[PDB]
Design a protein around this ligand. Structure first.
Ligand SMILES: O=c1ccc2ccccc2[nH]1
Ligand SMILES: O=c1ccc2ccccc2[nH]1
Ligand SMILES: [Br-]
Ligand SMILES: [Br-]
Ligand SMILES: [Tb+3]
Ligand SMILES: [Tb+3]
Length: 338
């Protein structure tokens, strides 16, 4: 009976959101089947993954494929366009994109890394962004025993990244049990061409992951524990615990403002509404800002929140020059003035 009290805190079973309004929010035209992750380059180009199919999660078009979208946030009325995937090393028909990350090389080549779930497996797909042609050149499919159930990655090189696994098991049945039981066996993996190893473990659904603009610190979101973990990142790529922030919302993906180092976090206020869909009780949205995360008292602000009648199931938010872009597991996306 301790397993029913725990399941109910973990999943925030009776929480309701306190709305926090922003002026001039607009749904992004063309985004109606998810925008689980996104990343804004310094130049204001934004990549969005959409169409995620996740075992046991709502989907309005179970049979249409995922895609990567592009938005130019320097435009005042930004429109989304579908990036074309070129290459013969990847089967696009099964494409099911999840978390993403980018890395800009010394030569200014932009690499896009994309978590992909063809079937119940996980890969990380490496693309080279071709800006002029609005297209993604496929370079490499990455798979490993230590990338069983990848949720997000943060790129530290063109085929180098830290990855969260949100489950230990691959079989959808077992990981459903693993989640309900609260085993907390999910873990974080460092991947490079030369070395692949676990760098942190024992997580209740590890989810978002990102890095400070100076590379010194790594941030890991633990969804069902409502925690964000901070780590010291050494030059040999090991991680050592430093802090743990707690929240009373389910934290999903982390974005990092390059100018300040602030974390911007997409959150699920109520775990039941996001995990067990019900078109009559849709899940809401919530966006946190965390400032001076190393200080003794970090500043945590709710910047946007709503019960779901506009935007359902916020997973990610990032800011660009006064605007805020918010994405969701399977619903729409919102572009707001701050
Ligand atoms: O922290 C732990 C503890 C036990 C255990 C058993 C099987 C697999 C992973 C495990 N992790
Ligand atoms: O990144 C993710 C992916 C799927 C998902 C499903 C339910 C709740 C949160 C989730 N987060
Ligand atoms: Br398995
Ligand atoms: Br909610
Ligand atoms: Tb990401
Ligand atoms: Tb996520």
């Amino acid at each position: 009976d301790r397993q029913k009290s725990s399941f109910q805190t973990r999943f925030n079973v009776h929480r309701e959101v306190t709305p926090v309004e922003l002026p001039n929010c607009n749904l992004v035209k063309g985004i109606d089947n998810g925008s689980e992750d996104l990343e804004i380059l310094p130049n204001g180009l934004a990549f969005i993954s959409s169409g995620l199919k996740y075992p046991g999660i709502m989907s309005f078009d179970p049979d249409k494929s995922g895609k990567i979208l592009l938005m130019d946030l320097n435009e005042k009325e930004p429109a989304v366009s579908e990036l074309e995937i070129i290459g013969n090393t990847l089967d696009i028909s099964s494409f099911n994109p999840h978390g993403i990350s980018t890395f800009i090389d010394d030569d200014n080549t932009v690499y896009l890394l994309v978590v992909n779930h063809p079937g119940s497996s996980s890969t990380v797909e490496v693309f080279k962004f071709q800006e002029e042609e609005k297209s993604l050149l496929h370079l490499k499919t990455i798979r490993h025993k230590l990338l069983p159930s990848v949720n997000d990655i943060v790129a530290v090189g063109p085929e180098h990244f830290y990855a969260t696994n949100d489950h230990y098991f691959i079989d959808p049945y077992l990981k459903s049990w693993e989640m309900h039981l609260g085993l907390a066996w999910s873990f974080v993996t460092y991947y490079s061409p030369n070395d692949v190893r676990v760098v942190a473990e024992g997580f209740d659904f590890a989810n978002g992951i990102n890095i400070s603009p100076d590379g010194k610190y790594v941030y890991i979101a633990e969804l069902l524990a409502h925690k964000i973990h901070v780590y010291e990142k050494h030059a040999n790529w090991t991680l050592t615990p430093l802090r743990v922030l707690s929240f009373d919302t389910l934290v999903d993906n982390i974005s990092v403002d390059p100018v300040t180092g602030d974390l911007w976090v997409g959150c699920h206020p109520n775990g039941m509404r996001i995990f067990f869909y019900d078109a009559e009780n849709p899940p809401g949205s919530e966006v946190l800002r965390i400032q001076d995360i190393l200080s003794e008292e970090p500043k945590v602000t709710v910047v946007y929140a709503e019960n779901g009648t506009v935007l359902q199931g916020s997973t990610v938010a990032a800011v660009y020059k006064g605007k805020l872009l918010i994405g969701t597991v399977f619903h729409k996306a919102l572009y707001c003035d701050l």
